[PDB]
Amino acid sequence: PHMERASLIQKAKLAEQAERYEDMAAFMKGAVEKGEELSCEERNLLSVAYKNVVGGQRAAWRVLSSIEQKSNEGPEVREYREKVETELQGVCDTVLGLLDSHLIKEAGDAESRVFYLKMKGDYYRYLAEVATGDDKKRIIDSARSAYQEAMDISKKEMPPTNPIRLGLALNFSVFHYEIANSPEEAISLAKTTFDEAMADLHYKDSTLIMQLLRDNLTLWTGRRASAP
Amino acid sequence: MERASLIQKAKLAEQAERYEDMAAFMKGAVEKGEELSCEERNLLSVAYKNVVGGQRAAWRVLSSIEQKSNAGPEVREYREKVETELQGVCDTVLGLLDSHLIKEAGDAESRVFYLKMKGDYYRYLAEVATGDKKRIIDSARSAYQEAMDISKKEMPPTNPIRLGLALNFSVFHYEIANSPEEAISLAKTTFDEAMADLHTLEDSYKDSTLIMQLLRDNLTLWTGLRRASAP
């Protein structure tokens, strides 16, 4: 079983080098299901895999949704957009299932707890991107609680230059602007995060997030970025 | 009707870069029977070219790692998984060409396109095959050679399907049949003959010049980083 777990993680690393993210996701899912807590590295494999999988589906959904909107003045677009929507929901539910049933409960330290709660907020946010019904409100609130719980921990346990916190703030400020429709909160959070991280420097990818905040702020004052 | 919707969805999947879906839709549309127009053949080929392209690239990466490790059995196992998947896609494409497209192809242009495709997909099987390999190599050779005979008789030396065919047949000679002289010969000849007959070059000048650029690249590589084949 740990013998197996090791092979699944090795195959997940191979799948990353071969850019076979659906396979990578499957291997990491299986490895998480062996029980063992994921390390610094192993966690990033999990997130990379699902980020790329869902990223492609989201991009496709946006393209199709955009075409469906231009045609308002062909039933195939709606049907195919629904197919992509369904697939994407399945992946988000899979990720949310792992986070709730395995990863968040088993996360001992604050770093990993932040990491998983940010992930939780992200995947509820991606469902909210397509969400339709009374369910949308629940999804939005489940996303809010996850990011807010993560914000409370990160403010108490991490410096303003930490990339999980910087990256969390980024994604929570995107949620505020797009999902919750609170562009003031969004801008506020992004400006505060940047300014607090700027005093003082100086852990390599932190600069990339800061570059993305600068970009979002310039955009929102006059496609928005989200953390990788 | 259903055919029209499948083709419309194949065009949507192209715009959304969902090539596995695109392939599935074009497969279904071919299975409605109707012959493919010029636009439709390109959708079919784009879809499967991208699908198989990703699997081949992954196979190369894994095969390269498997070679550097000589243990770790996971690389072999996962390379075999990718190999199996890849074979499934090639068999699917060859099944379509043999059972539906080549028999139903009336004109020479479409016949050459499908025979080149046939050669291409037997060549991708040959890239991974072991020992069946001889039959595969020969099935690939016959398809390309039949396509070459028709193209020389029916198409100008600047036609992009003819140039593409020659480029891929020369890659077949260099990599698969292990005939670098034939490969270089065919590539040089194809380039020089297209160059001489430029007065017969209209609307496909992007596709043709691109393939001529790839012939020059391969010639520069083979005389003295990764080799090019037609998209």
Curated annotation (Swiss-Prot), chain B:
InterPro entries tied to this protein: 14-3-3, 14-3-3_CS, 14-3-3_dom_sf, 14-3-3_domain, 14-3-3_sigma
A biological process from GO: intrinsic apoptotic signaling pathway in response to DNA damage
Post-translational modification summary for this protein: Ubiquitinated. Ubiquitination by RFFL induces proteasomal degradation and indirectly regulates p53/TP53 activation.
GO cellular component: cytoplasm; cytosol; extracellular exosome; extracellular space; nucleus
Tissue-by-tissue expression: Present mainly in tissues enriched in stratified squamous keratinizing epithelium.
MF annotations from Gene Ontology: cadherin binding; identical protein binding; phosphoserine residue binding; protein kinase binding; protein kinase C inhibitor activity; protein sequestering activity
Positions bearing Phosphoserine: S5
Chief location: cytoplasm
Site entry (Interaction with phosphoserine on interacting protein), positions: R56, R123
Keyword Ubl conjugation: yes
Domain of life: Eukaryota
Keywords: Cytoplasm, Nucleus, Phosphoprotein, Secreted, Ubl conjugation
Subcellular location as annotated: Cytoplasm; Nucleus; Secreted
Family of this protein: Belongs to the 14-3-3 family.
Record's subunit section: Homodimer. Interacts with KRT17 and SAMSN1. Found in a complex with XPO7, EIF4A1, ARHGAP1, VPS26A, VPS29 and VPS35. Interacts with GAB2. Interacts with SRPK2. Interacts with COPS6. Interacts with COP1; this interaction leads to proteasomal degradation. Interacts with the 'Thr-369' phosphorylated form of DAPK2. Interacts with PI4KB. Interacts with SLITRK1. Interacts with LRRK2; this interaction is dependent on LRRK2 phosphorylation.
Main function: Adapter protein implicated in the regulation of a large spectrum of both general and specialized signaling pathways. Binds to a large number of partners, usually by recognition of a phosphoserine or phosphothreonine motif. Binding generally results in the modulation of the activity of the binding partner. Promotes cytosolic retention of GBP1 GTPase by binding to phosphorylated GBP1, thereby inhibiting the innate immune response. Also acts as a TP53/p53-regulated inhibitor of G2/M progression.
Name of this protein: 14-3-3 protein sigma
Organism encoding this protein: Homo sapiens
Gene this protein is translated from: SFN
